[PDB]
Every structure is written in C-alpha cells, then in structure tokens.
Write a protein that binds this ligand. Sequence first.
Ligand SMILES: [Zn+2]
Ligand SMILES: [Zn+2]
Ligand SMILES: [Zn+2]
Lengths: 129, 619, 43, 441, 173
Amino acid sequence: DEAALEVVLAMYPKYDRITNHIHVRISHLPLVEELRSLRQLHLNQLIRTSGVVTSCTGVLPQLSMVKYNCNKCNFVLGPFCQSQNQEVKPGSCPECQSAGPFEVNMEETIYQNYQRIRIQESPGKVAAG
Amino acid sequence: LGQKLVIWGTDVNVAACKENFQRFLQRFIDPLPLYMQRLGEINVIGEPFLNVNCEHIKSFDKNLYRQLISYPQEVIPTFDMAVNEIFFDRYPDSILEHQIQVRPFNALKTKNMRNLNPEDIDQLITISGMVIRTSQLIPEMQEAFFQCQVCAHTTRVEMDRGRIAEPSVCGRCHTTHSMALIHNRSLFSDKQMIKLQESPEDMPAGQTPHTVILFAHNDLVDKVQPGDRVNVTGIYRAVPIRVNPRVSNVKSVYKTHIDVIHYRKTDAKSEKRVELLKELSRKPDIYERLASALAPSIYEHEDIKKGILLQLFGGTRKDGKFRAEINILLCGDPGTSKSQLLQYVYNLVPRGQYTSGKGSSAVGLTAYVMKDPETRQLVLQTGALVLSDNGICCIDEFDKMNESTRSVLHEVMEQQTLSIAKAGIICQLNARTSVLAAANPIESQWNPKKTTIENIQLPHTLLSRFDLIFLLLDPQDEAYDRRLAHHLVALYYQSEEQAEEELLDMAVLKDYIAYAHSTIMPRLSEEASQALIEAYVDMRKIGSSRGMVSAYPRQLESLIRLAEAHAKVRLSNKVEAIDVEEAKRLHREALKQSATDPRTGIVDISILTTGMSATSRKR
Amino acid sequence: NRELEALKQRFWKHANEKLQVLKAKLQEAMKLRRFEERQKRQA
Amino acid sequence: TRHKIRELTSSRIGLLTRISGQVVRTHPVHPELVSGTFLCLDCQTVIRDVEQQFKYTQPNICRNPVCANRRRFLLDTNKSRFVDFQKVRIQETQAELPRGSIPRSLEVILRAEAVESAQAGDKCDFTGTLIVVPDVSKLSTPGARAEETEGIRGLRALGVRDLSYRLVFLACCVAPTNPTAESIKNQMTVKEWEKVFEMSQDKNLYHNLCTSLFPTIHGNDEVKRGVLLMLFGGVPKTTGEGTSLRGDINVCIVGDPSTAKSQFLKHVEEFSPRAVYTSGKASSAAGLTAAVVRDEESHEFVIEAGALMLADNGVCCIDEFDKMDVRDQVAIHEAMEQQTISITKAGVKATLNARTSILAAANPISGHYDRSKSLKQNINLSAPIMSRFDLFFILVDECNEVTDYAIARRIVDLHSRIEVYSLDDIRRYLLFARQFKPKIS
Amino acid sequence: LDQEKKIDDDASAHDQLLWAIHLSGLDDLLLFLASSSAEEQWSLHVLEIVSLMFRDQNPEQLAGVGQGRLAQERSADFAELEVLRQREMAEKKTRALQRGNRHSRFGGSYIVQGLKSIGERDLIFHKGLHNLRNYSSDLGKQPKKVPKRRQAARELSIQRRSALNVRLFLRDF
DNA sequence: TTAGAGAATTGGAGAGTGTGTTTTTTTTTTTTT
Ligand SMILES: [Zn+2]
Ligand SMILES: [Zn+2]
Ligand SMILES: [Zn+2]
C-alpha cells in the first residue's frame, strides 16, 4: 500500500486531495480453499475461498485511529489504533494521570467503513441433506 | 478410640451399636445365620452391598431399629464397619473392589410425600412413588489432585463436606498460589438426580400430584428409569439454596431431597424349562394347544390365533434380503376383540410395540428429531417400527394414519429399513419388524356389500404387503352367540385359581417362543420344496383357466414364511409337507375371508388393484 | 503383463495443501535468479 | 474390548476406551489453543509452552526468576500452537439401546487428523478417553474473569462459587463401526487388476453381467440388458457456451403388479453403491426432489433434500412412479433432463444438483396392461415425462403354465438349494470401466 | 530448561555434541595433548575440556557399560515400571480405605468423649467415622510456609541415563 | 561453646478500592390440508 501510494503520487501529484491511502487488492491467488477444509494451518495466511453471502450488516463507522478527551482537563489522548480484536481502553491521561470516564473525540477521530458479512458454502457444493 | 464415640447430641454409643448389629448379623435366622448366607453370596458374586430388612432389625432389637431410623447418617456407616469387619474376619483373602455398603430398607412405605415434615429431617424414611425423570450421570469429586505449575510436585486433598482445602503453597518448592487442580487426575464417583411423583393409586381425590427429588450415588444411580414405580428408602435431607450463584446468602426456606439408600421396584410384574419344552413340542396337536392358549380372555377365532402364533414364531432369517417377518392384518367394527388381541400380544412378545396409526398416538410410527427439553440437545427419536426391529409392532387404528405414515409403512414392509433425511442426519435405520395391524371400516359398521379395501380405504399397494388378512365379523347365529354369552358370564366368574393357570400357560408360551427363537433354524426338505412349487402352480391354475389371474409369485414367499414358521412351532427344524399343507390351508382361509367379492367369490386381483374384475367391467 | 500394462495405459489416457507446492516451484525460480546474478557478476 | 454408553461411568475417567455410537450433530471446526506463548509485559521475557487446562490459562509465574509479575502477560498468537478441534453429539446405536429407555446422548471431542471424519447419521467406533470437563464459566483467572445441583467449592480461582462437572469423551481415533482414475488404480490390487482384465477380455460379457446381476429374475433378458447399460451410463459433456449435455441414462419398467418390475429395482439398489430406493409417494415433506421447511432451531426456512438429491451422482430407483405428488411431477421435469432442482421460496434460493440416473417402475392404469393399446394409453405419464426416458420396458403377466413352473422352481431353489461373477467383482469392474470416455468414430 | 526434559537413553544436545567430537576425532587430539610432554602448556585447557565432557556422568555407572547392556536395561525398565505401578496401586488402596464408601456430603457427627477439645468441651468430629481409626488433629490443617531463609537446599539436577553410543564412547575415552 | 541483647528483613492482618446483580401473541409462509 505504501509503495502503491508512492507510484500513484508520482503519476498524479494532486491525488492526495482525493485519497490518503491506496489499498492493494490481490486477485487470482492460487491458494484456493474450501470453507469446510480450513484448518489451523491456514491461520494468519492469505487464503482464497468461495461461497454465498448469507448475511450483511449495514455499512457502520468503526474507529481506526481514535482520540479521547480527558475526563477532567482539556488534554486529548494520543492516536490509538483499533485492532479488530478488543475494545481499546485509553489508559490514563499523561498530563494528570486521571483514568475516569473518557469519551471519544468524534471530530479528531479517524473512522473507517466496516461491514461484517457471513458467507457459507454454495448450496450446489454442499451435499444433499 | 472407637469406644469413646457417641453420636452427636444422641447419647448412643457407636461401639455398642456396632456390636448389636454384629450379633444381629450372626444370629438372625427366621425370615420364614440368615445374613451370613448373603455374605457368602457377596463373596461369590462380587457385588459390594448387603440388603437388610428393617423389620428384621426391629424384631431382633427394637432399640437398634430406633437408633437406625433416628440417626442413619452415623448408624449406617457403623453398620458398614460392622459388616466389613465380619466379612473380612471370614473369607480372609477374598478381594473386593470396595468396602461393603449396608442397605437397610423397609418392605413398605413408612410415610407419603404429602406428610413429610421438618420433623423427619436427617431421618431414614421409605416412600412409594413413580419416576418422572432421571438426569445424566453427574461426577462428584472425592479426592482433588493438585500439581505445582512451577516444579510439578503433586499432592492430594480429601473432600470436606463438599469443599476443598486447596494448598496455598507448594511443599517441594515454596511458591505461593502455584498448586493447580488437575481435574482428570482427581478421583470421582457417580451421582444422579431423580424426580419422583407420588403414585396415582396414592394421590387423594382430585388433587395434582406431589413430587420429590432423590439423589442416588455409586451403584444405585443406574438402576431406575422413568416410568418405574419404586419404594425408595433413604435419608430425608434438607439443604440451603443460595439466592444467586455468585453470592453465599441462602434462603431461609430450605430445599429437601432424599439420599437414596435402597431401591425396590414394585411394578416389575434354563434346563428345567428346556426339558419340559422338548417333550411338549412332540406332544400331539401342540400347534392347536398353543393357538388356543393365545388370548384366553376372548371368544375364539381359530385362524386369527393360528396366524398370530405363526407370526410370533416367524420364518428363518438368512442371506438374500428376503424377510422372515410375517405381516398380519385384522379387520372389523369398533367393539370387536382385535384391540384386545393387539394389547395381549404386545404384553406377551419381547421387543414388542403398541401404538395407534392416528396422529394423536403416544409414540409415533415414523422417526423424527427433537430437542431434548431437559438438555436442549437434539435426539433422534426412532419410531416404533425401528424400536421393534426384532419383534412385533402392533398398530391399532391402522386405517386412520395419514399418507406420509402410509408411505413410511410401505417402505418398512418392502425394504425392512427406514430412511432418515432429517436436517443434517442421513442414515438407514433397521426395521426388521413383524407388523400386526388392526383396521376399521370407514363407515360405522362393516358394509357387507363392499369389499375389504373398499371399506377400510387403504391403498391396495400397502394391502398387498400383508401376508395374512382376517375379519372379526360375528354371525347372526344363536349357535355362536349363546356359547359366546356362556363364555362371557364364565369370564365374569373367573377366579384366582384360573388366573394362575392361565398365567402359567402364558408363561410357558413365552418360554416356548423364546426357546424357538434362541436356536431352532428350519430348512426346506425336498418334498416340502415340491409341495410349495406345486402349490403355487395349483393356485395359478384356477385363474389361468378362464383367462383371469388368481395368484402371483409373492404369495409363494408368504407360503414359504408360513411353512417355516409352522416347522418352527413343532420344533421339527426341517420343513415338510405337513407344514406346507398347513401354510396352504391358513393362507387360503385368509383369502376366503378377505379376498371374497360378495358376487363372484374369491378374486385375487382385488388385492393387486382397487375394486375387482366386476367393477372394472361395470365401468 | 504387456496387455495388462496396455489396459493400464488406456485407463491413464482416460484418467485426465498447495502452499508448499507454490513455495517449492517458486523456490526454483529464485534459485535460477541467484545463479544468473552470480554468473553475471563473475563474468 | 468395547464399552456401552451406559457404561461410561466415573470409573472410566482417564482410561483408554472404545465405544460405538451414532452421530447426531457435528459442530464447526475451530482452532483450539494447546500451548500458549506469552510475553511478560513488565520485563519483556517470553514464556513458551504454557499448557492449557479446561480454561484459558496464562503463566503462573514469569520465567525470569527475579521477576515478581504474576498476572500481566500478553499472548503472542502467531508463535503459539493450535490444534483443530470439533465437538460432535452421539447417541446409543439402535442395537445397543436398552428397551423402553430414552436414547442417552454423549459429547465427543475430535482433534487434529480426526476432525470432520464423521457425519451425522454415521455409526462410528470412537477410541479415546472419557474425561471430565468443569463448568469453566465459574472459574476466574488472570487470563479471563468468570461469567439444580451444587458443585464443589473452595478454590481460589472459584471464589465463592461452586464448580460443577460434566463427562465428555475425547476421541483420539474415529472409524466406521462396521464398513480419480489414478486413485482407483493405486487403491486396487494386482489380483483385482487380473480380474478386471479377464472381464474386459470376456466373451459373452453382456449376458454374463446380466445373469450375475439378476439371478432371481426369470427371463426378461432384454430388460436385464437395458438396466445394465443404465448402470454403465454415457459420457457427460459441456458445450462451448457452458451448457451441459446429459450423460445419464433413464429407464422405466412398466408392468402388471405380479411381474418382476420391483425386483429389478431391488437388485440394482442392493448391487450399486450410492443408490436410493424410494416410492413415488413421499415419506417426508421432501419427496423425490426437495422441499422447504422451517428449521426447528432457527425458525427459518431451509432445504430438505429429496431422493434425487440424495442419489446425486448415483441411481434413484423409484417404485410406483405413477403415483407422484404434483410438486414432484413438475420438478422431475428439470431433474430428469437438466439434472438440477431450482428452488425459489421464502428464505431460500437454490440450484441443487440432481445428476442421477433414474430407474422408474410403474403400474398400468386400472392395474393391468392391454396389448391392443399403446403404452401412452396404458400409463398415465404425460408426453414430456415419456420423452425423458431413454428406454421403456413392458412386463405382461402371461398365464403360461411352463413359465409359472419355472418361476416356482427358481424361487424355491433360491430359498432351499442356495444357502458367474460376484457382485463385488462387478462393482470393481463398473468402477474401473466408468472412468472410460469413449469417442464417436 | 525447556529441552532438559529429555528422558533417559535419548541423545541430548550435549550427547550429540560429544558424538560430534567422537566422529571428528578431536577426542584423540585431546588424548594426544594430555599425553604430550612437549605440549604440556595446554594441560589446564585440556583438563577443562575433559571436565565439561564428563560433566553428566557417574564413574561406576559408566564403567559398568558394555556389549550386553541393551537387554539388561530393557528388562530393568520393564521391572521398574511394574514396581512403580504396584506402589501406586497400594497407595491408592490405602487412601480408598482411609476415606469411606459414602460420598463426602453424607453427613454425621460424633462426640469423642475422652478427647478434650482446645477448650474443655469434648471433641466434635465431622470428618467421618472412617478417619477415627487413624485420627490425628492435623487432618484439616494447612502446612506452614517455610520462610525464605529456612528453605532447605535442593539438588541442582536430576540424573538421566545418556545415549548408549555416547556412554560407550565416554567409557572408551 | 552456648545463648542472649540490638538491628534489619519478611509474614500477614487488615484497611481501602472497584465490580455486578432483579410460557405468549400476532403474523408470515410452506406444506398439508
Ligand atoms: Zn488529563
Ligand atoms: Zn512447587
Ligand atoms: Zn517478567
């Protein structure tokens, strides 16, 4: 993604006005897998699967780089990266050490589009019954 | 020192109680040295428990009985020490898996569920009841195994009234909070919860039944199933219940349950039999004797009883794919003896089933999948046809079943297997079952003008699978009805000396059938083969002449089944022309009853088709 | 067994987990890269 | 030794045991942590091979001997080791179930090589251990905090709560209880190769295979040939535009109810693997093709598979084919030619493969055949249904005394005396030969 | 510490290292350096090499090694396995007798009239009648934390029987 | 050679802080009526 951004801004120097990140997508990866055949050996590896989408959430905003107002003073906590694993807890304010009911700074927080889908095996690839 | 012990707040000496029970064991003899015979039975059988009658304890020593009833939690372990001391004073090198448990019991109930009071807490009681449910096997920890996660040093902790004295430090090393409970190296024993309703015979008039909880442990866990009726002897316990699982406050009102000490089931009802059966099989007209023994409580239908007897004995199962099972169908009005025949033979046969073709039946004919309500997990409830895989399936109200059930029965009769296409589950269940069916007319009472199929309104395809079909029509004849009425008034004047005789006849009939099934395996003789072959040709002759058809090859299979069954009845082990002649006679009698058109007589295509030849030419 | 082997050949004629296969067949190409670079440097 | 489900008492905990059971439900395969690698957050020391209980467990101490940390640890998921994990419910097999009892169900854990090796309905022998699994929701640890009978008490991890237990079988091995072209070649043996070659070179192989497959059938030699070619089948093909050309052969045997029409189906079904026998009338909501029914767990419309779907890439022996329900009478059009079943209902849209050869058996209208009339007049099948079948056969019950004589002789011989090729040999030869793809000269 | 859990008769990392020395022939060079009068300057070095080589071994056990050891050690392993199993079975039976054949929540309490409690009242016993055969007042007591200063010294390593090839090589060396 | 008085280190009592909780009806849809 970093390298693609460099090449894109070499070709179109003003494209930073439209984007701040280029997502490199990979297609025709030979590592095709059946959903029924995924194992622990495939963990943290780039897999390719097929299926029918059976559920979709609405497009929801998700925290990506979140900033928090301090619960007492006017300081704002540093950028914390969202992980998909757990809620990010701010910790304590480094100006004053308070750790109370912190709140998200919506205007300074960076969001990203989120959508959780459920895919299953296609009905013609599953066995009867 | 044991002699210093007294039960808490009781003034009873444990050592004196032990000695009194020991002399009881040594000297009680008269239930008509009694319990040393039971000790020897334990010694040879290897079961670690002794059943003892509290009435025997009472008659030997009233005070010992009072101590046992009042203070069972101490007195019963004292009796365990006594009996084990006697048992290992005798039989010095016999090895037992466990120490013996004394299991005192009262022969009858001392109390009932409605009169149980707080005065009875921690007291030995006996109550009668019916079982409503029985939990899965609960493992109760008996000794906790701890291992140090720093240095692998292990220790074992004994259970103190349900709580563990966890080691806070290791002994080998000295790390704190390092000892971890190794669950599967610990020791466990079986426990089970049972929910028991007061008996219907014991409920007061018009009241909803009361219910108690029993807890059984070790070997008494897997002795009682739902639906059983039991006199349970146990200690009436009271325990607190915490208000919510994460808080140790308890409700002032205590829960109660019974720690089971003893179960006695009260609804349960070899060469010395083989020697009788061998000569009784070669007694003359044993076939008639057994057939007349079937269902003495109803007025006699000879060929129906003969067919049911041959169904009970069945053919021989061999391998290819041909069914040894024999299928019988009974037809007649509601109010005939067909349902009594069904219920009788269901009570008689092993691996039997009885259910209704109506959709309101207690247990279904087809298999289904359901959420086990007490567990929420799926269970495959295989229907009665699959549960009776080596017995007779009695189907009352056989006409009232829906088309899906008719298809299921067609599948079971043709293929002797039931297919499962449930959600996720795919399997071929086994249903080698002999179906005995009882149908009704669609009208109120049997129409004489219309045919059997036209009256019961079941498909001819399914009717063609039955080996024999019979009718329970009663003639408008004094010659039959007068003697039937005499039989009925005599049945009112039935007495116990006739009841015992008929029960003995039914019991030896059961033993006869079981002994036949156990080993006797008929085969065809050459003369029997010729008789069956020429019988099929003879049945085809009467129809092939004049251009119609009067028989088809599956009737030869039915005749083979009946001949093999009759040889099985007479213990021959070789099928002969005697058996083949009886098969032809009974099959033709069934045809004379069922396949008779009122105009043209017996017509074979009334089973192969709906209607008959006359109808096919009337349209 | 020549005719039996011919029947085997006819059935083979009609005859018509993968990350490690990918890595191996790619490892061959990068080995060739290193060999060619070495040869060009030493030339 | 083998044990019953009723015999899985606490005495068997930790012992090697073998049980038989019928799989009722299989859950998804998950990755289970078998040994966690952890980082100590306040001294940066890595603790490897932290073995897991029936609770997710962090290090009890730091591996650094002078470090005082005992709860602040971070799992490194990339350097930890996981195992494939799957739980399946079983119950007692039909044979072992005691009379009158409810079926006793058991939970079985499959791991690593053994996951997804058993399917619901299979009867399998499980070899492994009976173990005990605590209620882990009651246990509170540094890794994770905690979420009518009374459990055991007094553990530090357990606090004021009580710990209950449940018995679970842990299967190290699973097998059935009573069981490509190159793949076939390598699987089979040299003696099997010799027998295959013998059959390939056999003269009169046509009639030999017919007689071997259909010994009970007297006569009807042409029907035998047709059914054999139905078993062998044609070559499926795909057009340039992607549409498929049907390869399977469809055969219908009409005849009087006294004839051998059902016996052909029975012989085919007991010979061939993956075959289904069914009646035209449905035993279930899904008849021949498919149905849409409400899930009892989800309260949601789901497919219920029919006989043709279960016979996909197989043979479906449909007896009483004249008595189909209207839903099957319509959907059999698509199933017989396009080899698909298309469903468009509430909650489900599906195209379900039905690549099956059909062997139908049917009765004439009014229950007997009339030779003066054509087959279209003798059976109720419509012209679209008639066009699907590759071969039609008719069986008329001739009232011929010598034929009845021979029939009785053959049947009673099969029952008394019996107590070219074997069906296993024909199975192996069919499986070998079906991989051939003949070309048109 | 991770990989020192090797069981006896297996090639540890040290055993494999000694086998590497053996196959390379540096052992013979060490013998030469030890026997040489001219190269006596390296005597302390060679002594330290030999010490670290024979770090794990026991002299009598090593001297007992020979041709017929495989059968001896196999039979000894089987016999020792059975001895361990019999000891564990005996201890399990003794514990099973010490506790009763009734579950732990089976109640019952006794007064031991002769035994005065920590007060003047008679002892009330709750841990079951089975325990009063070998009664002791420390049945339910937690042992004490030995303080750090008083914690006894523990032996620094377990002994393991190294690989037989390495043992034969070290015997010959 | 034992042991006892003064100084320093370790065990644990307890004071303080933070967390979690208390069958029913209307409507649809497919299959079966
Ligand atoms: Zn702040
Ligand atoms: Zn330790
Ligand atoms: Zn650390």
